[PDB]
């Protein structure tokens, strides 16, 4: 039932600068968030391929990922427009009425006696009581007890990776800022790093011909208006050459494209669709 | 060399009504045009899923974007539906070339220049000079011209594709209902492969596409293909799958509750691309 692999996507913040209005800038950020949610992307890495655009993108991505009942707690907000344009509707974004094995919550600032556990706002009709003693303001994943007229529901804090790794549920993404293209690779949140890296380009090899190797943590990387060339050339930590040398695979995911250029946000949907069968097979236990 | 098959996409004009501003409405139309151009779609069918304004606005934006830039003044007077065209992303298709670019074919408009029966016509093909052709044609007609390898020959508009393998844009068709998508196909034998899309469809990974000549991929709007099927008095079906050769979910295990039509076109045409390419080949 569980999914043992992760999928990360990297792209440059600069793509917001190419948007033609403030409204379209915000919509574009939403397009990115939605593409990643649709394809059950676990991490979005926003890199500086050269600042403002990177930070604005990352913040919108985080806001959209956050369950609605937690947003006012984590975001000074009103971002509200971005959320209206492109809601994720992901499995952790359930309504108060819906039954769920897991829920995201925030530990509430309640005066408690040491050792007596904590109270969590999981967006339910009642607070959830947990045995772990945690600081108010932390975001946690709670597994609700199967057996529950008490003042609270009861649950236990579990790893935020449990819904995916144990139940096969998509549970949103984390957003990482990277100061350059080398940092996309170097500052992976996995000890082992990304063991399968895939770059994308019209100059890549045919995606249809590639055999994806078995993997645990995949990374798919996208460029902006000037391709992965911009990021590669700007970073002194990286080999000076065409970008294909920086990846395990470097693929064209739309053979015979009928437009001269495919935009980053279009390419993420096309590429993740093209790679989905392969990633599913190669990532399986 | 040539590509012997066509690919048509159908969707409801009603999706423009779900856009949250006038500017986003125009932007969304452009998203449809670009998704179709990227995938070398030859025809976009805009249908009325209620069984008029959204459909006409979508159709007009699609046609405007398809038209080579040097012919837009001739074919597109200023209109309210195109007031936000500046926010559109150009298609940058093969027939959208600059004046300096060498090309085997160019689109043109026959122009009013002195001629006599039998002495042919002149065509504005966007080149430095108007192009002389041997065929007598009325001014104002759009034609495909094969340049002599400033003289050319008017050829079938399907030659760039069928002979040279070039994507050459799309035609736009309005359909008054879902059944008309099928019934008013511009091909004599109709669409011989029809593919509907839905989260309730069978897994696209198991689909086996039969050899085909004219493929059709159909998308619903906010309420799915159920809406158009239900609203059309020419159909009396329980659910939409029986209208199609294949009825497919193209994004297994999707991580959002709903995939919007414009997202789904990109995902589904990507998912089907290997299959379509293989099954349509000579
Ligand atoms: N055919 C294709 N296959 C895979 N990815 C593509 C693609 N076309 C565009 N992309 C993705 O979309 C991004 C923006 S398009 C970049 C265009 C640039 N002229 C260049 O030389 O690459 C690219 O960096 C790549 O990540
Ligand atoms: N998983 C999926 N596979 C294929 N097409 C999909 C899809 N999800 C959405 N679509 C396409 O996008 C359109 C808009 S989404 C429609 C959702 C509607 N609640 C319904 O019951 O269908 C659909 O009509 C379909 O053409």
Swiss-Prot record, chain B:
Subcellular location per the Swiss-Prot or TrEMBL entry: Cytoplasm, Cytoskeleton, Spindle; Chromosome, Centromere, Kinetochore; Cytoplasm, Cytoskeleton, Microtubule organizing center, Centrosome
Residue positions annotated to bind S-adenosyl-L-homocysteine are: 197, 200, 220, 249-250
GO cellular component, as recorded: cytoplasm; kinetochore; mitotic spindle; spindle pole centrosome
Keyword list (alphabetical) reads: Cell cycle, Cell division, Centromere, Chromosome, Cytoplasm, Cytoskeleton, Kinetochore, Methyltransferase, Mitosis, RNA-binding, rRNA processing, S-adenosyl-L-methionine, Transferase
Its top-level enzyme class, in one word, is transferase
Fill in the misc note. Answer: Depletion with RNAi causes a significant accumulation of cells in later prometaphase with misaligned chromosomes.
State the similarity comment.
Belongs to the class IV-like SAM-binding methyltransferase superfamily.
Q: What is this protein's name? A: 28S rRNA (uridine-N(3))-methyltransferase
Q: Which organism is it from?
A: Homo sapiens (Human)
Tell me the classification of the organism that encodes this protein: Eukaryota, Metazoa, Chordata, Craniata, Vertebrata
What is the primary gene name for this protein? SPOUT1
* Residue numbers of the full-length protein present here: 69 to 374 of 376
